[PDB]
Write a protein that binds this ligand. Structure first.
Ligand SMILES: CC(=O)N[C@@H]1[C@@H](O)[C@H](O)[C@@H](CO)O[C@H]1O
Ligand SMILES: CC(=O)N[C@@H]1[C@@H](O)[C@H](O)[C@@H](CO)O[C@H]1O
Ligand SMILES: *[C@@H]1O[C@H](CO)[C@@H](O)[C@H](O)[C@H]1NC(C)=O
Ligand SMILES: [Ca+2]
Ligand SMILES: [Ca+2]
Ligand SMILES: [Ca+2]
Ligand SMILES: [Ca+2]
Ligand SMILES: [Mn+2]
Ligand SMILES: [Mn+2]
Ligand SMILES: [Mn+2]
Ligand SMILES: [Mn+2]
Lengths: 230, 230, 230, 230
């Protein structure tokens, strides 16, 4: 699967759910209006990405990169915020997934499937119980990230995320290039065959809360996956 | 922390919860009596194990070995498994953790936080949809193993586990030497410091169901952890 | 360290050694002229890169991206490849590094010290005796790759490489997105602080042989690294 | 391949090269006579170990333990080390492999093919630039350890090593339990299939120098490998 949005236009290639909307300048707004309380937005590439193949046991490798900005509104504290994720094709927004559950986790499940790279702007009770405030986490089947690094969340600042999944070694690795010329990285060993079905969606889920809220605006997104085949 | 049980005595050094009992000949029985119905058994080292140190940021390495056997009773089908696990101190047998949730996962949560190596004798819907029947799995925060290998579960047969956590690369590795002299291995990169508090319990959880059950008898357990205070 | 060459200017930001030169249309040619016969070319970022810090024991994370094309000349078979590499600052083109040694390995040593991602166009004796012909490899201290993946080398075809080093888990991961919309990835655990000194060059090395040769023309290159000071 | 030496007898099960001999009480002495200057000793299991299989592409897993003591020679500084290593079946002590090269590396090459866990008693210039004196390293195709931890080398003190190779994740993990009951660990991702042929030796190499020397006495050694032939 190969795609490249250098901007977003309604062209039938994406699937919006909840409060995700294409605002002009070709911005993917998640949510379109953060003043609405407790938004949940999904923005999925419109066809399934094969990530593994039953006949071969082969797993896909992929890279995706996206540039985005999270932004305060106006004196509200920021939440919740925005993820890139793989979920079973057929999954809708889960129940009991609002706010700090990022539109990807119910909350009560268990049970609960999903690989995510989260850009978490709000410290919940389960969050890197560090004094991390904002953080970049990798989630596997849990809102409690299996790894996470501090994120100097800067309102309106361009963040450039690159995520590589290497099927050979089963590593998901993330790098986020900040406007200040620094990078943050975090990685996690995940075998996609162990935790997800052979076809998933890829794309974003973003939430906000009330009074807590922020913009999650995605400016570009490229994605390349390859499943061998045999 | 360093201990070595060549057999088990009820000497205050372990905490037994639920159906865990010392049974004949210093065998740690989990459960003592599988005829009972659905059993959940915890046997934990009775002192919290320091796995990382907040001051220095150092993380413990460890090596642990245990030998055990799982046995059929009677003509019942086998379930559910026995796991070695680390969890935050204050860990109690969670609610909703019967059967396939192996006494460590609250099926109606979401907030499950533990690291386990599972010896899982019954394929649940969330189990490796490889065709694995029995399997050895590594779990973090989820009953869906991040990695797993299959297990030739042989009733009555001695299994010899060795698990190495290497804090330098943050890999948990498991080898199982089977009665036939073969070994099974599985590993997972896990940053202990990111998924668990400074002090954890180490020990075992095992469940049985109804009608599915089996014995899980632990014969020996040694553990060495070293945490750099510089 | 942060830089981003959308093309290459003769601007003192790089060090060129051997046959490396800025060539037509702002491209980095390695070598500038393959017709010559055997070439070795180095093009290094001209400032040492700090990749670990003595006081904290911290290791740098980085992400680097570069677009490049390798091209046949015109009937010769291709050799030898181009690499992205880290080497001890003060690196010169090593003795005995011609041809398949990629300008990074002194073949009569032993003391070779470097981390490289190679795009190797020619199967030498030590190359994946898979039947791989061209391959993308991760090299540490040796010309024999620790991990390699097969590479559909297409003459004149644009390749877009991304390499992420995550200091958290110590994993170097490569993605190369090919013109056909496929990607190849390869990944390797590498502790930069075990294998390299605290200041390194980043850059490229490329060689051609006689008769075997090809162009390696790099079009763009961005690099962001972050080393923590506390 | 499975074996277990609780002591070493002259039973033709191993292959001894250079100064490896069975010494008093079935100790494997490497060198037998540390008064000799610049000793090299190999002690290999005398049957190849299949570590991977061409037809299926599967890699073996293995677990191995051995206990050994390194001991000073009075008035002499200690060198150089003892290593557990895998090398192509048919491997011979390399030329130019004395002293710091541990009988595994030809210091004038290239091209050295092996995987080793070294117990290195003599800090060479290429040794971990940590301040380590003695250290336990993982070596792939280089004398310069891909990873290392430091070793509190104590003359005459029992060391208990456990090494697991997990073919699933491709990770070599070492634990070493010291006489004081602390453990040291170190791991490295190495896909044996990328670096070694199908059949390998497993065993030990040890060197001394002049005037530096020490005994490397091995007391016990067990090994279990399993290679999936489907
Ligand atoms: C500490 C430990 O690992 N267990 C030991 C074992 O090494 C030894 O064989 C046995 C009797 O000698 O006592 C117990
Ligand atoms: C790993 C292994 O096989 N260890 C065994 C040990 O359990 C046994 O008591 C001894 C008998 O000689 O041989 C050795
Ligand atoms: C390099 O610069 C170009 C143009 O200024 C821009 O599109 C891009 O953000 C930069 N590349 C990276 C990866 O930082
Ligand atoms: Ca949160
Ligand atoms: Ca199960
Ligand atoms: Ca080559
Ligand atoms: Ca040395
Ligand atoms: Mn979070
Ligand atoms: Mn399971
Ligand atoms: Mn190569
Ligand atoms: Mn060394």
């Amino acid at each position: 699967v190969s795609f490249n949005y250098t901007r977003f236009k309604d062209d039938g290639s994406l699937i919006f759910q909840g409060d995700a909307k294409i605002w002009t300048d070709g911005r993917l707004a998640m949510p379109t209006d953060p003043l609405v309380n407790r938004t949940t937005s999904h923005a999925l590439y419109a066809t399934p990405v094969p990530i593994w193949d039953s006949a071969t046991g082969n797993v896909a490798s992929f890279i995706t990169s996206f540039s985005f900005i999270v932004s305060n509104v106006q004196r509200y504290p920021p939440t919740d915020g925005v993820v890139f994720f793989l979920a079973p094709w057929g999954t809708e927004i889960p129940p009991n997934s609002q706010g700090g559950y990022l539109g990807i986790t119910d909350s009560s499940n268990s049970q609960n499937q999903f690989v995510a790279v989260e850009f978490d702007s709000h410290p919940n009770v389960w969050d890197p119980k560090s004094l991390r405030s904002s953080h970049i986490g990798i989630d596997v089947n849990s809102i409690m990230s299996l790894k996470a690094v501090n994120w100097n969340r800067v309102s309106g600042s361009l963040e450039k995320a690159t995520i590589i999944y290497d099927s050979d070694t089963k590593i998901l690795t993330v790098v986020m290039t900040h406007q200040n010329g620094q990078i943050t990285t975090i990685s996690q060993e995940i075998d996609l065959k162990t935790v997800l079905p052979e076809k998933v969606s890829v794309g974003f889920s973003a939430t906000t809360w009330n009074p807590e809220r922020e913009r999650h605006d995605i400016y570009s997104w490229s994605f390349t996956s390859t499943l061998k085949e045999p």
